[PDB]
Design a protein around this nucleic acid. Structure first.
Lengths: 735, 249, 708, 23
RNA sequence: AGUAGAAACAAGGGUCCCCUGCUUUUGCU
């Protein structure tokens, strides 16, 4: 008897046991060294899929750029970047015709958004590339550095605080003949026009980690602060358009996406009934971001913004223009070793331009030789493609337009098609009287996609009668089935803090019960396993136990001191009172009535030093990386207690030359903290004011002192002392 | 008093004076988020790795004078070392436990009022009545519902201005309240929140949670009401239905 | 007029006026009448407030408290703040608009105005504009005229005279300049400026180079797009496109699919972090729950119970290693154990001496020295790091035996779950009984023992790595179980010595040496133990049914490595259970929705329903629901233990083939566009991983059984 | 509930090689 | 040696001692 779990599929349909095919209990693959090889491969592939294009030399950056738009029509089934401008414009026009006024209303909404957005809105990013430092930094730090440099270079249009003013500042800086930057011992560095322009158009490349379902690693890119605002406005417009398209899978959630898929399936099923065949294609596009051209996005944006104010069109056009002249950094470089001498060394990517090729292996040597002509200032020129892939919504608009082209009035034949699109993923459904019509419709859709630079992957796609299909790991078999394994990694200690972790674990169990068909008994067992993992991770075993930990003595003392032991939190060595019925109740309020008065007062003491509250946007909110997709924001219910602490931070920066920024950050915090003591609402809603910190602080202090003296809360001596100190601050500010 | 003295101390230094004078109120939203710390990539792994260290937690400086340096068992509770990029100190989890057994007690009577939503949930569960379980084929439709029992049908703007009036009366600005519902809500909240030591930001967040309606797409099968979507996980199953009636209207 | 105003006022007044007008976004050099009006208003208000204090009783005083509070000449935020604070503290209802200042002796807002026109006109205008009945209004005139509400002049006659004199003299200076007549004040018109955002300079040059090939400027492209109409463009270019571009549908029939091609090469070898089916444990009786006692004390006790230790000797040497170092490592472990034994104090951790054998076995100083490129560019053999494909291996029969063993039932319980809240709802009671069945079936599975061993080992290794990254720490391999007689037992599998663990990256490797007891002779399957050096350490007198039989006892010693991410995922092996259990529940519930009753008891007790789960020489074997649960648990555990990019790729690619085969079995007429491409994608993931090779072989078996 | 399996052989496992009794 | 797999770890910096364990490298709805 040789056990073979796959044989279980002989009785259970594959969908109904699809969880068996997801090995999400082991660690996912990770990159170990450099991503330079992946970046060079991506650049070479992008330039190869569009090689029958026009080669030009940029007059500004002096870089070789490849233009495949309106190139020779494809003659084979290999990926092609030769999108046709007329075809793209025709698709956009027909999309507008089928949904009249969509572009106009979307443009009105985006125009309203553009004039009200603030520059600080750019702080809600993640590891933006910083040209001032030439490395990745958090979005807020990069924005602050860019604003500092702009101010030091006589570019202060952003004082107004509007995002569009910052974009005007970037526009003007592009015209500066010399840029002055500060490098850490402060040193002044001067960048000529071309050098600064190349830096402003640079994308920093790295390699993706914790990616499931792949054997080989791939490269991703992140842009700098010079293009993020333009991308933000373009994506706002694209989101506005997508929200009004029923065939678009964005920006809706999973449940709404499944609802849309079910709706379209039913719509295409009732129509057929018994008079025609219907076939579903579980499709997938290959090299999505390597064959989308920024020039085509410029064309679509131009068409969308017809009959609109010139400034709006210019603002929306900037981002495709800058992406058409982008450059990619080639990662960290490579590592060489000498076995005989037992040495290892790091070769930066900047030296790949004129380094002897005897060091590299055959494949790397070929990559470097192929990419050498594109190298400028340590970066590779990449005109075609969308490596960074920030236009996830414009691409969705193009896919939805191709889908909309499938209406019977546009096919002008017996076959027609409809479906759903979400970035590079799509599900198609073709209805036709017979199999020949089905083949004709499939061919028409494939060729039309090819005409606009979309290449369906034939190796990862299949077609079957429209009863079952798959869409981004949602498996439909006459109704969507549960895929519990996809959520397995989320079951565990999140790593925020004790209170947040308990809340998130319980909430995840509840949500999986609601959505992923987690059964009651399995839910109870998951609760038990989570409690065990929580106790082990936080060393908060029950007080009565004899498990030896550094925290055991204090927990035992608290346990022996307590009278009502059921009231203690699990973090405090208490029992687990959670079950199915109360999965929606936070722990502190679950056992509020069972807690001792003194323990309750100590635990929920607002003066405790462990609790620290940031802005409201981060209250009871955590960032969680799912198994698939980008990091999400999850909100949990929890009472602020002594268990809502914050873990320490990395200290490696203390050993580098960037250590100077640490102190700077510290200084800022001081000032900001002081500002909270004068304007307590500042952490709730962002304050606005052109005046400096000092003026507002002194005004508020004077006014509060006077009002308090009027109310009799402060004696005249204290009022005089405060007025004297305020006068001292006022006179000291001038000098 | 303390505010102005701290402002003077800040103004004494040159770098802090330059920061204070050369930064506008708009630029504060940017310089306050200025940080060298990257958002954690693998919080679970980092938490497991950090809990094996002596001092994984951060605390305010006041802890130095509020809990002893060492335990009765000579177990160190906090270290003098400052957290990177801040004046907070590194402390061990033991300190937290210490505070939970020997910390200064305070009266907790506004907490059920401030966290009204959670305690409403627990009270609703306490007085609910369960029925039988029925084993039958369950049909679930993915529909939009509102997970917020007791919301006052306030959107972002109106809820935010009501919260501003209740929690930060002097910072309300130009806005005034007209609808009688807003006035009565504000009056009742101000009366009940009088002399509350909970953090104002937490109070504002809880008021927003209690007053603003939220919606979600969920696969519902039975009644579509807030009090019922609250226990959806308990009432509906793949093949079973649990008859239940929440004890709160 | 600008210079006259700037030179005739206190710098503070003019500066406040500039900041105020800039707050509105206007241009001081363009609008000046408004500047003059606001500066005069500021001057008069400051004279109003100046020289007015309040004594202790609350009466007037002329040269401490300030009688008036100014509102004008401040940012809208600060003005609104001051008015709100005044209204809140004093009780006077705040006005809809912004007043000029506030008096406190009478506790009410007072408005000041300066206008050439007659006092009554401006007074009525502002009174009907503000529409406030509790705020004073005090209008002054350039000619000296002045009036307020009810003729009630709040300021002293001397102060009013001073204000009138100052206004008269500034008016006289304005007349002297000759611009007095052409001033006539200026009312705020609230003009609106259209937004503009131009593309010029380098930006326009870049834009002109971001267009299709046949366009020279962005303006030309915009003009073309704005006048574009659809005229059969797509149809024409579809007509032109070559017919070789197509998505031809290849029918997927029962004779279409072929078995996957597994790689060829030497047989695969064991690569788990600990022995699975060849593990041997020395056991003791002690009443301790999970992770309660001191591991070293338990290990010493377990060692004591075994009599029959022997001088160790190499049985199966590690081909690529130095086997005497392994022998010396085992001897050193024994000596250190004796040393701790004769201590009368058992530490929570033991640090092993940094001997030569442990230095070699743990890769001490094996990293190359890091040097600058300029200092070694001339080295003859300097070259890029080896980045070739892993060597291929062929499937071996031991992995299937391992899985079979892992699917079996054990006599001892291996997991004790924590308490939960009491059941109050009927559904909770049903869940409790169903979970009793699940816990009984899953606690007595060998895969659960593997879960416990892996969790313990990974937790200990990670904790040691963080706590002491410079010491060689001895970590016993311990598990706890409950026998069928209900008595607790502590089992020792062997020992682990971790090396230096300065783990910075998540993929950084900490090396360790594992020494594990076994009864398996390595010479039966040498290819499985390529990485191991196997010793003979004793003769164990096994107690069998008929009597007692002597068997050699072996010590499998090897060097292994693990990273932070691998350790973290090994610490979370318990979730494996959930996977299998979830799949089991959905299988019972699916069958309970058609019979209107719970079938858990029927499924688990009577074993009426079975599922095909195994293969036999006679045919496909069917197992009960418990057997299916245990098999899925074993599959999850082996996924966790043998994780690799090969497994991820194979799973992702073979899912599509499984779905296509299912569509064929549902008679949905499946079709493919490039089936050979899918087969190549699947087969490129099968290189050397025994678990992935076994999964591919399982897929081949299922494929041959599913199409007949 | 006591789990049982038909594959259990009362005699084939003369001694358990993983958890045997050795006095 | 071992981990591992398309490139890395097998400690890295600084001046016995000191610092560091995600910080030259993790994007986007």
């Amino acid at each position: 008897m040789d056990v073979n779990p796959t044989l279980l599929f002989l009785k259970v349909p594959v969908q109904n046991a699809i969880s068996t095919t997801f090995p999400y209990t082991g660690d996912p693959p990770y990159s170990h060294g450099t991503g330079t090889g992946y970046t060079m491969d991506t650049v070479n592939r992008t330039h190869k899929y569009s090689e029958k294009g026009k080669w030009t030399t940029n007059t500004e950056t002096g870089a070789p750029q490849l233009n495949p738009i309106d190139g020779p029509l494809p003659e084979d089934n290999e990926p092609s970047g030769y999108a046709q401008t007329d075809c793209v414009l025709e698709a956009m026009a027909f999309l507008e015709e089928s949904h009249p006024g969509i572009f106009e209303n979307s443009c009105l909404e985006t125009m309203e958004i553009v004039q009200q957005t603030r520059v600080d809105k750019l702080t809600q990013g993640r590891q933006t590339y910083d040209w001032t430092l030439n490395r990745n930094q958090p979005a807020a730090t990069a924005l602050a550095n860019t604003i500092e440099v702009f101010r030091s270079n006589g570019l202060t249009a952003n004082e107004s605080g509007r995002l569009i003013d910052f974009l005007k500042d970037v526009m003007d800086s592009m015209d500066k003949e010399e840029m002055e930057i500060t490098t850490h011992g402060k040193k002044k560095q001067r960048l000529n026009k071309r050098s600064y322009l190349i830096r402003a158009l640079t994308l920093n490349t790295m390699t993706k980690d914790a990616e499931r379902g792949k054997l080989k690693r791939r490269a991703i890119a992140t842009p700098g602060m010079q293009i993020r605002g333009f991308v933000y406005f373009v994506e706002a417009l694209a989101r506005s358009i997508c929200e009004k398209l029923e065939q678009s899978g964005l920006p809706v959630g999973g449940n709404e996406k499944k609802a849309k898929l079910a709706n379209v399936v039913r719509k295409m099923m009732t129509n057929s009934q018994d008079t025609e065949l219907s076939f579903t294609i579980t499709g997938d596009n290959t090299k999505w971001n390597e064959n989308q051209n920024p020039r085509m996005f410029l064309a679509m944006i131009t068409y969308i913004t017809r009959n609109q104010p010139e400034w709006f069109r210019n603002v929306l056009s900037i981002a495709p223009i800058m992406f058409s002249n982008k450059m990619a950094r080639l990662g960290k470089g490579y590592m060489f070793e000498s076995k005989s001498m037992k040495l290892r060394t790091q070769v930066p990517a900047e030296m790949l331009a004129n380094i002897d090729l005897k060091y590299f292996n055959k494949s790397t040597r070929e990559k470097i030789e192929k990419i050498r002509p594109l190298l400028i200032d340590g970066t590779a020129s990449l005109s075609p493609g969308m490596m960074m892939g920030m236009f996830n919504m414009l691409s969705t608009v193009l896919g939805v337009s191709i889908l909309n082209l499938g209406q019977k009035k546009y096919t002008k034949t017996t076959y027609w098609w409809d479906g759903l699109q979400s970035s590079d993923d799509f599900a198609l459904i073709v209805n036709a009287p017979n199999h020949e019509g089905i083949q004709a419709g499939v061919d028409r859709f494939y060729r039309t996609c090819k005409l606009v630079g979309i290449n369906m992957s034939k190796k990862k796609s299949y077609i079957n009668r429209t009863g079952t299909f798959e869409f981004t790991s949602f498996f439909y078999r006459y109704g969507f089935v549960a895929n519990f394994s996809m959520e397995l990694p989320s079951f565990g200690v999140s790593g925020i803090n004790e209170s947040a972790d308990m809340s998130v674990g319980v909430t995840v169990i509840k949500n999986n019960m609601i959505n992923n068909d987690l059964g009651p008994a399995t839910a109870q067992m998951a609760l038990q396993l989570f409690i065990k993992d929580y106790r082990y991770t936080y060393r908060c075993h029950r007080g009565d136990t004899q498990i030896q930990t550094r925290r055991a003595f204090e927990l035992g003392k608290l346990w022996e001191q307590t009278r009502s032991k059921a009231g203690l939190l699990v973090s405090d060595g208490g029992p687990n009172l959670y079950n199915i019925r109360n999965l929606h109740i936070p722990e502190v309020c679950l056992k509020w009535e069972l807690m001792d008065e003194d323990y309750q007062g100590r635990l929920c003491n607002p003066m405790n030093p462990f609790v620290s509250h940031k802005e409201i946007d981060s209250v009871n909110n955590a960032v969680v990386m799912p198994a698939h997709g980008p990091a999400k924001s999850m909100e949990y219910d929890a009472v602020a207690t002594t268990h809502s602490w914050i873990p320490k931070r990395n200290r490696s920066i203390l050993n580098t030359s960037q250590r100077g920024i640490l102190e700077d950050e510290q200084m800022y915090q001081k000032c900001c903290n002081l500002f909270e003591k004068f304007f307590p609402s500042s952490s709730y809603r962002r304050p606005v004011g052109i005046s400096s910190m000092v003026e507002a602080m002194v005004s508020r202090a004077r006014i509060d002192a006077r009002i308090d003296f009027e109310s009799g809360r402060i004696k005249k001596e204290e009022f005089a002392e405060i007025m004297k100190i305020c006068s001292t601050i006022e006179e000291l500010r001038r000098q | 008093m303390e505010r102005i003295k701290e402002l003077r101390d800040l103004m004494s230094q040159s770098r802090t004076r330059e920061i204070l004078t050369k930064t506008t109120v708009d630029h504060m939203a940017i310089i306050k988020k200025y940080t060298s710390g990257r958002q954690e990539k693998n919080p679970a792994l980092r938490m497991k790795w950090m809990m094996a260290m002596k001092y994984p937690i951060t605390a305010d400086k006041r802890i130095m004078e509020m809990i002893p340096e060492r335990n009765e068992q000579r177990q160190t509770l906090w270290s003098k070392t400052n957290d990177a990029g801040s004046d907070r100190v590194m402390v061990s989890p033991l300190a937290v436990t210490w505070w939970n057994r020997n910390g200064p007690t305070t009266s907790t009577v506004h907490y059920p009022k401030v966290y009204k939503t959670y305690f409403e949930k627990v009270e609703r569960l306490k007085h609910g009545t369960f029925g039988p379980v029925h084993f039958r084929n369950q049909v679930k439709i993915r529909r939009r519902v509102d997970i917020n029992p007791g919301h006052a049908d306030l959107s972002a703007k109106e809820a935010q201005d009501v919260i501003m009036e209740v929690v930060f009366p002097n910072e309300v600005g130009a806005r005034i309240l007209t609808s009688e519902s807003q006035l009565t809500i504000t009056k009742e909240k101000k009366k009940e929140l009088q002399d509350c030591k909970i953090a104002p930001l937490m109070v504002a967040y809880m008021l927003e949670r209690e007053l603003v309606r939220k919606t979600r797409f969920l696969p519902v099968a039975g009644g579509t009401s807030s009090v019922y979507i609250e226990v959806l996980h308990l009432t509906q199953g793949t093949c079973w239905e649990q008859m239940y009636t929440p004890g709160g209207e | 007029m600008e210079d006259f105003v700037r030179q005739c006022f206190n710098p503070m007044i003019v500066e406040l006026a500039e900041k105020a007008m800039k707050e509105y976004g206007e241009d001081p050099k363009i609008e000046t009448n408004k500047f003059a009006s606001i500066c005069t208003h500021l001057e008069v208000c400051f004279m109003y407030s100046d020289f007015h204090f309040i004594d202790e009783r609350g009466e007037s005083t002329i040269i401490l408290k300030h009688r008036f509070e100014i509102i004008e000449g401040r940012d809208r935020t600060m003005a609104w703040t001051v008015v709100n604070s005044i209204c809140n503290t004093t009780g006077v209802e705040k006005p809809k608009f912004l007043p000029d200042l506030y008096d406190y002796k009478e506790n009410r807002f007072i408005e000041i105005g300066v206008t050439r026109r007659e006092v009554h006109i401006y007074y009525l205008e502002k009174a009907n504009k503000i529409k406030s009945e509790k705020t004073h209004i005090h209008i002054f005139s350039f000619t000296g005229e002045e009036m307020a509400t009810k003729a009630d002049y709040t300021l002293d006659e001397e102060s009013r005279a001073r204000i009138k004199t100052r206004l008269f003299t500034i008016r006289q200076e304005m007349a002297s300049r000759g611009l007095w007549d052409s001033f006539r004040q200026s009312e705020r018109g609230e003009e609106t400026i259209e937004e503009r955002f131009e593309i010029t300079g380098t930006m326009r040059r870049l834009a002109d180079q971001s267009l299709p090939p046949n366009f020279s400027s962005l303006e030309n492209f915009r003009a073309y797009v704005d006048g574009f109409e659809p005229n059969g463009c797509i149809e024409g270019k579809l007509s032109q496109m070559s017919k070789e571009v197509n998505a031809r549908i290849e029918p997927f029939l029962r004779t279409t699919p072929r078995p996957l091609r597994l790689p060829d090469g030497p047989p695969c070898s064991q690569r788990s972090k600990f022995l699975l089916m060849d593990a041997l444990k020395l056991s003791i009786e002690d009443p301790s729950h999970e992770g309660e006692g001191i591991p070293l004390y338990d290990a010493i006790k377990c060692m004591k119970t075994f009599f029959g230790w022997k001088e160790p000797n190499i049985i199966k040497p590690h081909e690529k290693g130095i086997n005497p170092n392994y022998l010396l490592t085992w001897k050193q472990v024994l000596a250190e154990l004796q040393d701790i034994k004769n201590e009368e104090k058992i530490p929570r951790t033991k640090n092993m001496k940094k001997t030569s054998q442990l230095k070699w076995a743990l890769g001490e100083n094996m990293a190359p020295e890091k040097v600058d490129f300029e200092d070694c560019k001339d080295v003859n053999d300097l070259k890029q790091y080896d980045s070739d494909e892993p060597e291929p291996r062929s499937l071996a029969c031991w992995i299937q035996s391992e899985f079979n063993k892992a699917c079996e039932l054990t006599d001892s319980s291996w997991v004790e779950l924590d308490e939960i809240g009491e059941d109050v709802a009927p559904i909770e009671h049903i869940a409790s009984m169903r979970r009793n069945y699940f816990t009984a079936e899953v606690s007595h599975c060998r895969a659960t023992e593997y879960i416990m061993k892996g969790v313990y080992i990974n937790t200990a290794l990670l904790n040691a790595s963080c706590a002491a990254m410079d010491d060689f720490q001895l970590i016993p391999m311990i598990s706890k179980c409950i026998t069928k007689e209900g008595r607790r037992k502590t089992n020792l599998y062997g020992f682990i010595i971790k090396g230096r663990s300065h783990l910075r990256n998540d993929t950084d490797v900490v090396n360790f040496v594992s020494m594990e007891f076994s009864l398996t002779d390595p010479r039966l399957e040498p290819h499985k133990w390529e990485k191991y050096c196997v010793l003979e350490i004793g003769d164990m007198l096994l107690r069998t049914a008929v009597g007692q039989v002597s068997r050699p006892m072996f010590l499998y010693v090897r060097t292994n490595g693990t990273s932070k991410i691998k350790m973290k995922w090994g610490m979370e092996m318990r979730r494996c259970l959930l996977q299998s259990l979830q799949q089991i529940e959905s299988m019972i519930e699916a069958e309970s929705s058609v019979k209107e009753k719970d079938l858990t008891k029927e499924f688990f007790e009577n074993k009426s329903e079975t599922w095909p789960i195994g293969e036999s020489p006679k045919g496909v074997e069917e197992g009960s629901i418990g057997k299916v649960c245990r098999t899925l648990l074993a599959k999850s555990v082996f996924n966790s233990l043998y994780a690799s990019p090969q497994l991820e790729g194979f799973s992702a690619e073979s899912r599509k083939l499984l779905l296509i085969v299912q569509a064929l079995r549902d008679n949905l007429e499946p079709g493919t566009f490039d089936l050979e491409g899918l087969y190549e994608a699947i087969e490129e993931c099968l290189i050397n991983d025994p678990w992935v090779l076994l999964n591919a072989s399982w897929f081949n078996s299922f494929l041959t059984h599913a199409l007949r | 509930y006591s789990p049982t399996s038909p594959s259990y052989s009362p005699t084939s496992p003369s001694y358990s090689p993983t958890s045997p009794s050795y006095s």
